Each structure stands twice: as C-alpha cells, then as structure tokens.
Symmetry: C3
Subunit: 319 residues, 3 copies
C-alpha cells in the first residue's frame, strides 16, 4: 500500500488535473486536500513553462520533498522546439528538467542576453504565435546568450533573416540550451526564456506517471527510467476511459491518488522520504488511555475491602 | 480561545508593529517570539510595497501557512493611485493582493516593459516625488507593459506630456494592473513596479484586523469580507489608545497576540490550518506518568499482605 | 554532545566540503544524509557568490533554520575587491552577508543599473578575467546603480578610462555596496552583481567554523564574534592534516559533523533552535508500555483469589466447630 507524503514540507507539481484553484472539479484527478504546497497549472509542464504561454506560472518548489504528476502537456513540444542548430534534444532537456524538479535545488532567474549593438526591447506574437518579450535587431550583429559556468536550462526562439552559430546557418524555430550561446551575423527577433536553474540535487520526490490520450512522446516516456517513477492507472499506456473526457477526471486515477494521500496516522516528520509503504511508515504515537487500568484497580479494591469485612467477622467469631 | 499557528511552516506578514528586527520594542505589538518566518517592515503594506519606497522589502511567503497583521499603511493609497485610465480600483487591487498573500502560491518578479523606440533607463524623483527606477521616452512612441496570460498585479506611475490608452487621454498619477497595458503617443517618464504573481490559491492563512487611528479606508475595510478575517482589539474600529502612541504598542493588542501565540502543547503537525480553538486543537502527546497508578498498586499490595497474615492466623488459631 | 538540527525546515549552506551532488566523495566533509535543504557549491562563499564565477549558484535559503559551514573560499577576496572609492570594507561586507545568511529573511534579485545614455549590454572577460555581464559606455556619462531605500549588498567591478564618485577619481577593480551609487563622467565597462537582499533577521542558525589551510583572513576570522559561531576540528586554526588534501575530506571534521547530525530520537518540532545539547534536546515520545502495570494487577488478582478459597475453608471450618 503506497503512502505519499502529505505534509507542509512537500510541493505537489502538477497540471490541470491537480489545478484545484483554477479548474472545474469535474476535470481534477487530485480531489483530496493536499497539506503541502500546490503548484499546478492547467496546460503547463516542465518544458511548456518555458514557452511563454503561461508567463507567471513557472514551477518554483522550495521544499525538501516533491510529488510530480505532470508531463502529458510537454508532448506538445516537437521538432520545431529543438531545431536551432546546437539545441539540446528534447529527450535530454526533459531529463534535466524532470531531474531538477524532482531532486533539485532550483530557481527561476533572468537569462543574460546581450549584443554588439543596442537591441530594441518589445513584445510580439511573430516569433511564437503568442505574446512574448523580444529583442529586435534591425542590422546584423553578434548576439550572446547565457554565461559560462551557468547551471540550468533556458529556451530560445528566433525569427531571423540572417545569422549562424559557429558558421552553421540558423534555422527559425526554438531550442533548449544549458550552456552559453553566440549567434553571428544575426538580424531579426529573439526570445529568450528565464533559466530553470538546477544546482544541488539532494531534495527528494516521487514522480507519478502522467498519461496522455495518445502514446507518450519519447522525451516524457523516458521518465520511466528514473528511480522515482511510479506507475499510475492507465490502459496500455494511455489515460483511462473512466473520466470526464479522454484526458481528465479518471475515477481510477482519483482513487489511486486519494488512497495514497490519506494513509491514516503517519508521522511524516520521522521519515526522510517522499513516500513509504504503509506497514513500514512511522506511525503517530497516541495518548495512553488509563481508564481500563483504573477500573481494574477499583474492582480489586472492592474484593479486598470486602475481604477485610469478612476477615474481621471470622476473627471475632473465632474469639 | 484562539490559537494561532506558531510553527516553522508559517510566515507572519506584517508592518512596523511586527518588525521585530528593525523597530524599537516600544512600538511593537508582536512582542513574543514567532517560530515561523517573519516578513514585517516599517511603513509597508501589500499595496505600499509597490510604491517604490520598498525596493528590497517585497513580501515573498513560500510556506504553506500565513498570518497577516497589516493594512493600516495601505490606507495612504488614494485616488491618485487609481487614476490612470483603465486602472483597477483600490478595492479590487487590495482584494486580489490580500487574497494572494493569504492563500496564494506567490512570487515577485520583474515586469516586462518595452516600446517601439529605445528609451533611457535611469532613476528620478520626478514621477512619484521620491527616487525610483524610470524609463524616459522623450519622443512620442508606443509603450507596452506586461504580457498576455500573466497572473499577478503590478503598479504603474507616469509623468507624461502626451499619451492615451485605447484613445482615452492619460491622466498623470498611478494605477494598478493585472493585465498587459499599451500606451499610444506616449512621451514622458514611466515607473513600473515588479509583479506580485498570484498563481494557485490553496495555501492557508489567518487575516488579523489591522486598525488605523481613523476609520479604515474602503479598500482595507473590505478585508472583513474574507473568511479568514479575525477581529483584533479596537475602539469603534480605531486602534486602541493604550499604546506607546496612537498607532503602536497597544497593551491590549499585545496581550491578544501573545496569548494566541502561546497556547501550550499544541501539535501543529496534526492540523492542516493556520489556527484552531484551544479545546479543539490537537495536543502534544506526552510520556505517560504512571506514578499515581503505581501508588494505587502499592496501597492495594500493603493491604493484601495484611490479609495474608490475618488469614494464616485464623488457620492456626483453629488449634 | 552537540546536536545539529537535521530536519526539513533547515538549510545547510556550504562549499565543496558539503557539495554532495557535485564533488568527489573523498573531498566531502558532510558525508551523512542531511534531511533539510542542501545549498553547497564547490569554490563558493557568501562573498564569492557575487563574483560572477558561479552565476547560477547564489545562496537563497527560505527556511526558518540554517547551518553554515563555509568561509574559507571568501578569503580569496582581497584589496582589489574593496578598491573602488566608497566601497564597504570586506570586514563589514562579510559581517552583513554572514548575518544575512544566518538570521536573514533574504532574496537574490536583479540590481538596478541606469545611465544618462543607453548602456550597451554584453559579456566579456576583460573586467574580471572571466565571463560576466557588463554594460559598455563609450561616452563619458552618469551611471547610477542601486535604488534609494534598498536593503542588501551587491558587488561592482569596473574597467574605466574615466569617471569619479562624488568628485573622487575612480580606481579600477571592485567594491561592495549596500546603498545606491552614482558615477559621474564614467567611460568604460561595468559589471554589477545581483543583490543579496537582507530584510528582517529573526531566522536562526548555527555558524560552524570554516578553516583554511593558512590562518583565516580578517574578514572571515571575525565570524568568531557572532553568537552562533561553533568551533570545528582544526590544528592551530587551520584545516586538519587528516584529509584527502590540505583543504578537504578531513577524517576528524567528518566524524564531528556526522556525530552532530545523528543524535537519536530528537523531536526537533518541539524546539525553536538550530541546535541543542543532547541531554537538553527534546526526545521523541514513545507508546506507553503497560505490561508491568498489567502484571502487577494480575499477580494481585491471583492472590486475592487464593484468599477467597482459604476464607471459605475457614468460614466453614468454624461453623462446624
Ligand atoms: Mg528504475
Ligand atoms: Mg493497578
Ligand atoms: Mg561569542
């Protein structure tokens, strides 16, 4: 019997299925109260949080423990999200992000961007299809992003009319990076997301399977390789058909999560883990009820005091 | 009998009356040690933190639980703080901010600002009357602030010689916003505060009344409508006259707060709440003291030994 | 026996000797699992975090409690780190930073930089010897850093061909500042670090001595004046000679830290402190064992039952006679 840590030192990292504040209950899978911090946003994911669609909803756990239930939305990242030459693959970007949310001492901070000429700061839909901050360069220049020694991942998207990286002609679209970047002969617009910094990795999590209504993309499928991965109810890898719609509100997922979060009388303060099996979990110590011991003392006292009455009479009758 | 959660997973959000680090003790109302995180600043409030007076003192709770004791300073925001056309009302801005500090998964982050031309970044007292960060646009241009999809509140203050919002001529002063903004034909100087991001809202608080020395302004008075509101000692809504001055050090407020924070032997780990009534609060389990039960045994034993003697004596006395 | 708070509401703030995630185990001193949050980076310190060498590794504790085991690396700051006129001394900068990490409600945020002209944003090795963000000003201008009312410390480094502060000619190098700054007639390149904001100071820590392989520089030696300072194993003030090298992996430091973090059955939830002496620490309560009380009851009941038997024999042995 799985027991998940339901305690104020734990952050639940989720998507619409856990977004209790902002999603109609009919579409929730997390339908019990979570005593820790809830960071769950409809439509979001660890890659999607860098897209600019949800500019205020970055995941920023600061607790020792985490439980993750997300990933389905990250399968909308595809080839155009790793098309800038020298971009990380989505497989490797996702691995670093999921490891970071699970184990990491993480932050979200502004990414360095500069250039050999003054760029124009504005916002536009022309790079991604929705409004993000851009720098516009109206003549060709050197553009630099990130800093040597950095430890984290950021997303870049470009709409360039010229430019190369190390002599390789740029291709318009996006990419993920965990090192500094330099574009030469660059003209056009550039979006750079904040950096998801991942420093030390001694925090702890459970990673609950997030299923889609189609087979998972490779970069989220590979989360099965992490020691923290725990299966959740699914039908051949696909989200169950017992919900409100094909993607939300599964009765069996709800029962799985609720049961795992309502183990009775677990003293979470006494185990350094984001979960435990019920029989092995440390249990709360309770007040001792001494009423039954007191009843025995009374019943014995009764027979004794009546033994005293009897004895005296036997003593007199023997006189 | 009110018990407030006095525990490391709780953030106390306050003003001079709770600023134990930086205010003379004679002016404090929070005069007992708080076992959680204390974020309290002389002069500050959830609106005032955006004024530019507090560039390093924004409130940033990251804990599951909060206790708020602030608002009196926010009553110095007035008509000039909601005068930019399309600004939020102070009533609505305060409501979002107090709900955010109380229940929110919150962050404080830089607000996007851009324009159709390059302006100048500097600092001046010309916009608000005191030194803040400003952008100067000496030629009329399009100025853009915030981003579609954002979830939070920021403050804008302008000193403009031209400009309009959607064709409505701008009025100099300030406003609060929770959506992106666009000014057309803008010439002059603009201050933009950081954004108080409010994402999910499943954290928990108590909101303790903060009284002024006159009746509260409308936008703070309305905090009485929140489920978390708890009255604090007052005289017809005004701060009591039993303190160091008209605004600080009330003997009766001090006793109220100290009593509520020193309920003995509450096991806060076993209740998912920022307060409880004493009789209903979960109590710490203590080692059981068996001394009285052991004394009862010894008395019984003394008597039974006597009966053993007297019985033997009867048996022999049957000589 | 020292017991250090080993609990999820505590942040361990360290350097390579505690950087369990990223440092070879032979060079670790913290070799036991820490149940709280670990923020420890090889080569870093509370001053060095502002240098730009570790741009993603700023210390950002958000917990009520902290344990510090760092400082040796901050002795690489020297005269060139307080040479800009009006800079804080390293003694005063370190004091504010160590108090902030120990006791502070802290944040790490961007530092305001503005000017009378548009500064060119770029990155270069020319100011510090390694790559950092700089602004370049190619015309003599007014440059302003920080904001009135701020509460925190930031680092500035310059490579200027002209400029002054309040009429005092600038000197190239670095400085630490906790107030807004203004340079006049400035021309050249300027690096400005993020701000380590220190607001209220009612969080709590233990500050464990961090020893170097030579005697400590003055600005870290002075951490002994703080109430929270606790000595750690050392040989005449320098790191012991029982480690992997002269600066890491000391066998005696390891034992000191492991012993202090493995006090058995401490109920940290019942003490508002980052440490306690073992005998005084609150201990976990266990279920009460009533077996001895039950044995005493049962023994008594057996005896009283023999009395019933023998009384009846008596009560009868008399009615006969
Ligand atoms: Mg495995
Ligand atoms: Mg008994
Ligand atoms: Mg001392």
């Amino acid at each position: 019997r799985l027991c998940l840590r339901n305690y104020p030192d734990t952050t639940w990292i989720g998507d619409s299925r856990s977004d209790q504040s902002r999603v109609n209950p009919q579409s929730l899978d997390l339908v019990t109260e979570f005593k820790g911090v809830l960071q769950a946003k409809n439509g979001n994911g660890l890659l999607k949080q860098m897209s600019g669609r949800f500019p205020s909803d970055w995941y920023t756990p600061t607790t020792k423990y985490r439980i993750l239930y997300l990933g389905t939305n990250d399968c909308t990242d595809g080839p155009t999200d790793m098309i800038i030459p020298t971009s990380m693959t989505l497989d490797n970007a996702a691995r670093e992000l999921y490891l970071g949310a699970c184990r990491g001492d993480v932050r979200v901070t502004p990414t360095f961007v500069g250039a050999a000429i003054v760029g124009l700061v504005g916002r536009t839909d022309a790079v991604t299809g929705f409004s993000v901050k851009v720098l516009t360069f109206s003549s060709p220049t050197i553009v630099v992003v990130g800093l040597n020694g950095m430890s984290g991942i950021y997303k870049v998207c470009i709409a360039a009319t010229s430019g190369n990286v190390g002599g390789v002609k740029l291709i318009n679209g996006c990419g993920y990076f965990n090192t500094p970047l330099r574009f030469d002969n660059f003209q056009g617009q550039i979006y750079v997301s904040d950096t998801f910094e991942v420093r030390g990795t001694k925090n702890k999590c459970v990673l609950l399977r997030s299923s889609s209504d189609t087979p998972l993309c490779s970069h989220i499928m590979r989360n099965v390789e992490l020691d923290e991965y725990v299966d959740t109810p699914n039908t051949g890898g696909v989200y169950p058909s017992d919900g409100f719609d094909s993607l939300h509100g599964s009765a069996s997922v709800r029962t799985f999560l609720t049961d795992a979060l309502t183990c009775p009388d677990i003293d979470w303060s006494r185990i350094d883990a984001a979960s435990c099996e019920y029989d092995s979990c440390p249990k709360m110590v309770k007040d001792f009820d001494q009423t039954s011991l007191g009843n025995t003392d009374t019943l014995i006292m009764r027979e004794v005091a009546l033994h005293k009455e009897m004895i005296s009479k036997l003593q007199r009758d023997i006189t």
